[PDB]
Design a protein around this ligand. Structure first.
Ligand code: LMN
Ligand code: ZMA
Length: 271
């Protein structure tokens, strides 16, 4: 009840602060202004919105406020566009690291700032289409009361959101990271190579923390759908899963500060 609201507010504040610090650090320092950091600040902007908007939206869904069907769908499905945007950003970082390690010579030619920003724009406009899919159609609406179970079809969340828009990119980026580390093993000039591995491990960890926090919620949703006969998951368990999913937005500034020395130095300069 009140504990859920307090923890959601704390998570929102921490995520907003950390990701604003990350964006300010990237913008302030020319050394950090790489291509991978463009995807990093895209994911940081996704986390910022998760903190500013998605968490209050989840609180409102918890309170069960009444509103119009379209507004209710926007409230319920806003988190999905940000989660998909984060998926696309992590996939972009994985592909960028694969290009940087497997073919370092042609990395500059293949990977350019204009291409990076274009790819970010395409990923952000595709994520909104995927996450807001229940808004246009594929809806279970029939002032409708707001419940994520009611106004959002489980099948869209259990098939389209999870098996296709989440699991497939997650498996692709898993394969990409395993290929990255296999190529790093084959390639072993030594100081430059260990920086790429240290940079690949930094990226591989935030990608893991994402799958660690978001998949519990999706597995609970699948158990709700694939086994209707079994009792619905506990409400406290549901709130805990939501809290775990929203806590992923908080973690990765800490990972950046802990692993990357440049990020820590520019954070200290800002702080
Ligand atoms: C949803 C999917 C999300 C993405 C998942 C990606 C999983 C990738 C696993 C990759 C990983 C585990 C550690 C990764 C970090 C933690 C990851 C988990 C975090 C959970 C919060 C196992 O990677 C190996 O795992 C084996 C199975 O165990 C596979 O078999 C191998 O093919 C695979 O490469 C990498 O382990 C190791 O790989 C090697 C290079 O190979 C790294 O470089 C080595 O040391 C450098 C000097 O330090 C040298 O300079 C470099 O020359 C040398 O080679 C190591 O430093 C280390 O990193
Ligand atoms: N299944 C589900 N439920 C909720 N909230 C409903 C909480 C609830 C659950 C059971 C009940 O009897 C009454 C209320 N939020 C949810 N968010 C998500 C989600 C976000 C991203 C992927 O799944 N799934 N999800």
């Amino acid at each position: 009840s009140s504990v859920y609201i307090t923890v959601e507010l704390a998570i929102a504040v921490l995520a907003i602060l950390g990701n604003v610090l990350v964006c300010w650090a990237v913008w302030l320092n020319s050394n950090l202004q790489n291509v991978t950091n463009y995807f990093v600040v895209s994911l940081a902007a996704a986390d910022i919105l998760v903190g500013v908007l998605a968490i209050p939206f989840a609180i409102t869904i918890s309170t069960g406020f009444c509103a119009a069907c379209h507004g209710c769908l926007f409230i319920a499905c806003f988190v999905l566009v940000l989660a998909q945007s984060s998926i696309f950003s992590l996939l972009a970082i994985a592909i960028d690291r694969y290009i940087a390690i497997a073919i370092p010579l042609r990395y500059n030619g293949l990977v350019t700032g204009t291409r990076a920003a274009g790819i970010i724009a395409i990923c952000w406009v595709l994520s909104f289409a995927i996450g807001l899919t229940p808004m246009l159609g594929w809806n279970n609406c029939g002032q409708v009361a707001c419940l994520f179970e009611d106004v959002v079809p489980m099948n869209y969340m259990v098939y389209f959101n999870f098996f296709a828009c989440v699991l497939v990119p997650l498996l692709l980026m898993l394969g990409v990271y395993l290929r990255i580390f296999a190529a790093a093993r084959r390639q072993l000039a030594r100081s430059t190579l260990q920086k790429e591995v240290h940079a690949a491990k930094s990226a591989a960890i935030i990608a893991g923390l994402f799958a660690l926090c978001w998949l519990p919620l999706h597995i609970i949703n699948c158990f709700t759908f694939f086994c209707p006969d079994c009792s619905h998951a506990p409400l406290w368990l549901m709130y805990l899963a939501i809290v775990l999913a929203h806590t992923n937005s908080v973690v990765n500034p800490f990972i950046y500060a802990y692993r990357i020395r440049e990020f820590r130095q520019t954070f200290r300069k800002i702080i």
